[PDB]
Design an enzyme around this catalytic site. Structure first.
Site, PDB file in Angstrom:
ATOM      1  N   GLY A 106      40.004  44.097  31.424  1.00  0.00           N
ATOM      2  CA  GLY A 106      39.075  43.827  30.149  1.00  0.00           C
ATOM      3  C   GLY A 106      37.952  43.063  30.399  1.00  0.00           C
ATOM      4  O   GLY A 106      37.274  42.569  29.265  1.00  0.00           O
ATOM      5  N   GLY A 107      37.643  42.641  31.617  1.00  0.00           N
ATOM      6  CA  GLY A 107      36.487  41.942  31.852  1.00  0.00           C
ATOM      7  C   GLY A 107      36.297  40.476  31.434  1.00  0.00           C
ATOM      8  O   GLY A 107      35.404  39.908  31.369  1.00  0.00           O
ATOM      9  N   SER A 189      41.427  44.866  37.816  1.00  0.00           N
ATOM     10  CA  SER A 189      39.923  44.618  37.257  1.00  0.00           C
ATOM     11  C   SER A 189      40.030  43.066  37.192  1.00  0.00           C
ATOM     12  O   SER A 189      40.287  42.264  37.841  1.00  0.00           O
ATOM     13  CB  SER A 189      39.792  45.392  36.002  1.00  0.00           C
ATOM     14  OG  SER A 189      38.417  45.522  35.576  1.00  0.00           O
TER      15      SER A 189
END
Ligand SMILES: *[C@@H]1O[C@H](CO)[C@@H](O[C@@H]2O[C@H](CO)[C@@H](O[C@@H]3O[C@H](CO)[C@@H](O)[C@H](O)[C@@H]3O)[C@H](O)[C@H]2NC(C)=O)[C@H](O)[C@H]1NC(C)=O
Ligand SMILES: CC(=O)N[C@@H]1[C@@H](O)[C@H](O)[C@@H](CO)O[C@H]1O
Ligand SMILES: CC(=O)N[C@@H]1[C@@H](O)[C@H](O)[C@@H](CO)O[C@H]1O
Ligand SMILES: *[C@@H]1O[C@H](CO)[C@@H](O)[C@H](O)[C@H]1NC(C)=O
Ligand SMILES: *[C@@H]1O[C@H](CO)[C@@H](O)[C@H](O)[C@H]1NC(C)=O
Ligand SMILES: *[C@@H]1O[C@H](CO)[C@@H](O)[C@H](O)[C@H]1NC(C)=O
Ligand SMILES: OC[C@H]1O[C@H](O)[C@@H](O)[C@@H](O)[C@@H]1O
Ligand SMILES: [Cl-]
Length: 517
Positions: A106-107, A189
């Site tokens: 989710g960055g 991620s």
């Protein structure tokens, strides 16, 4: 009814979970920390409250409210520090099963891989693993950075949530049939970037929290200093209506979530232009403790835990995130706005290493360049750096992959093999959310799921993806001098990393100082 509706007693609390016909028990929405609300906002997570009443663990808690999001009862909230465990129904506290601890992405802006189902992986393992997921704070609530935060609060709160969750598993997973001495952390991620922080935490002393790591699409955006984020703190204080308060942090802690969300939004870094806004705004900073250095530097120094590593990337990491560039200048403005210390000369050099390129469907003429450059800078080159760094110390226990799963609708969208596309191949179709009716994972890409899933389970169980790999899957050899398994339906095989990619990674390497990575 604990012979039918499973109850787990953790001392501080007892949870009642769900038994599935699949032979898996689920414990959803357990608390691993106190709600980070009121005074605990912008602070490190604190122990969850002791409570003698039976706690329901039959439903997920809300995920952490992130950048530009809205509170929704039961779905998205400040009160979000939950952990979820899946275990074989027959497992007891004596089972001591390998544990798979999943850290979502989710960055650092959102919780974007939340509530993934571990049922299929447990069944595929033949019922001898335990799977764990959890939420951690993001956006302004997880990553507000200022001397004022640090003087009465804690920097990188969202990563400290992850530390708390890792320690929760170490302390309690034995009660769910897990082996606390056999935990593998798996980050995707921003969770994979988080894994790099866990490996290099405090300079790399082994705290015994895990014995292996899966690094699925590294994400290493700019990592600035505290002083470099003061502009952001001040802007946040302004946007939330807190600028006339004497004690800025106290005033922030009084604001309701709706008010906070007015400041929980993107804007330009100093040195950046007004458009495009940076992809990522609230971000991990060098905090001098958990995060003493840049990731590239820490892995160069060997300041990280030496455990077996499975690490890899997709062919087109950058495709969902790169500016839709129409020109050389668009590419440079994109990079400058995400890395404002890049010089005019360095930006031109980027355009020489990644020139215009073939036209991609549905995108402007320079998007191919933008995407290749950004994919390499932020994801793939970091991943390769993790592989080569870890392999210096454990050359026999470092495995690299390239996902090249080709989906026609991805290709028609111009996004190639995009960031984390393999997630349903790791966890099983349906485990990561509802798939479309025409998903290739249900048709012509079906066959890559058993292959991918088995490698990942095998690594979780034995720290080697080969031991229990899918029956007809090829041997996956270690990193060596730059070798990786290409994962692709009906076309999975070892391949060499091309000299041209290694050269491109040396180029990004020469820019770690201005990019602050
Ligand atoms: C994770 O995935 C598994 C499937 O792989 C999900 O299990 C299925 O869960 C549903 C309930 O959502 C079960 O159907 C319920 O069955 C009970 C017991 O008879 C009944 O009271 C209800 O009327 C309803 O039919 C279904 O049996 C089960 N499938 C299997 C094979 O066990 C599970 O729900 C997913 N977990 C999460 C958190 O999403
Ligand atoms: C049986 C029981 O005590 N359950 C309560 C429930 O009534 C309430 O909605 C919740 C408040 O968060 O606390 C719990
Ligand atoms: C083993 C399997 O899934 N078989 C499919 C088959 O249904 C289909 O006709 C064909 C199309 O080329 O792809 C293959
Ligand atoms: C104790 O847990 C129960 C059951 O979830 C809940 O009703 C109650 O609000 C909790 N008590 C406190 C003071 O947190
Ligand atoms: C990219 O730009 C082109 C031309 O400006 C436009 O037609 C297309 O919609 C844009 N695509 C995306 C993904 O924004
Ligand atoms: C993989 O081969 C199988 C069996 O022939 C087929 O069903 C499927 O369409 C193939 N997928 C791809 C991407 O070639
Ligand atoms: O709760 C009873 C439940 O038992 C089991 C399943 O076979 C369901 O069909 C049924 O509803
Ligand atoms: Cl009972």
């Amino acid at each position: 009814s604990h012979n039918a509706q499973p109850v787990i007693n953790l001392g501080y609390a007892r949870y009642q979970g769900v038994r599935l016909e699949a032979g898996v028990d689920e414990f959803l929405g357990m608390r691993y920390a106190s709600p980070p609300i009121g005074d605990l906002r912008f602070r490190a997570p604190q122990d969850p409250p002791a409570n003698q009443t039976l706690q329901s663990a039959t439903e997920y808690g809300p995920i952490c409210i992130g950048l530009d999001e809205e509170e929704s009862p039961g779905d998205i909230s400040e009160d979000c520090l939950f952990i979820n465990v899946f275990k074989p129904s027959t497992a007891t506290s004596q089972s001591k099963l390998p544990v798979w601890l999943f850290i979502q992405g989710g960055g650092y802006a959102e919780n974007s891989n939340a509530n993934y189902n571990g049922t299929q992986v447990i069944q595929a393992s033949d019922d001898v693993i335990v799977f764990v997921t959890f939420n951690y704070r993001v956006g302004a609530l997880g990553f507000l950075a200022s001397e004022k935060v640090r003087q009465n609060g804690d920097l990188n709160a969202g990563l400290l949530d992850q530390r708390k969750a890792l320690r929760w598993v170490k302390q309690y997973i034995e009660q769910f049939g897990g082996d606390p001495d056999h935990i593998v952390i798996h980050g995707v991620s921003a969770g994979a970037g988080s894994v790099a922080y866990h490996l290099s935490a405090y300079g790399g002393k082994d705290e015994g929290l895990f014995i292996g790591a899966i690094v699925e699409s590294s994400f290493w955006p700019t990592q600035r200093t505290v002083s470099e984020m003061e502009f952001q703190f001040e802007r946040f204080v302004n946007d939330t209506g807190c600028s006339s308060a004497r004690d800025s942090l106290e005033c922030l802690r009084e604001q309701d979530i709706a008010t906070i969300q007015k400041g929980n939004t993107g804007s330009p870094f100093p040195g950046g232009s007004s458009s495009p806004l940076p992809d990522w705004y609230f971000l991990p900073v060098t905090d001098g403790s958990l995060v003493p250095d840049e990731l590239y530097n820490a892995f160069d120094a060997g300041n990280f835990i030496k455990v077996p590593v499975l690490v890899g990337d997709d062919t087109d990491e950058g495709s969902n995130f790169a500016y839709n560039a129409s020109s050389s200048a668009d590419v440079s403005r994109f990079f400058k706005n995400n890395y404002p210390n890049l010089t005019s000369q360095q930006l031109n050099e980027i355009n020489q290493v990644y020139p215009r390129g073939k036209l991609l469907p549905r995108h402007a003429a320079y998007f191919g360049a933008s995407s290749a450059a950004y994919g390499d800078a932020t994801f793939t080159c970091p991943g390769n750096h993790v592989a080569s760094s870890a392999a210096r110390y454990l050359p026999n226990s470092v495995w690299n992959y390239r996902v090249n799963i080709i989906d026609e609708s991805n290709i028609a969208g111009g996004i190639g093999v995009p960031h984390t596309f393999e997630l349903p191949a790791i966890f099983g179709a349906g485990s990561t959310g509802t798939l479309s009716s025409d998903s290739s994972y249900l048709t012509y890409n079906a066959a890559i799921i058993p292959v991918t899933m088995h490698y990942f389970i095998s690594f979780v169980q034995t720290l080697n993806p080969n031991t229990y790999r899918y029956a007809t899957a090829p041997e996956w050899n270690t990193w060596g001098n730059g070798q990786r398994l290409r994962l692709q339906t009906n076309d999975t095989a070892m391949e060499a990393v091309p000299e041209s990619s290694l050269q491109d990674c040396a180029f990004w390497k020469s820019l770690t100082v201005p990019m602050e990575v």
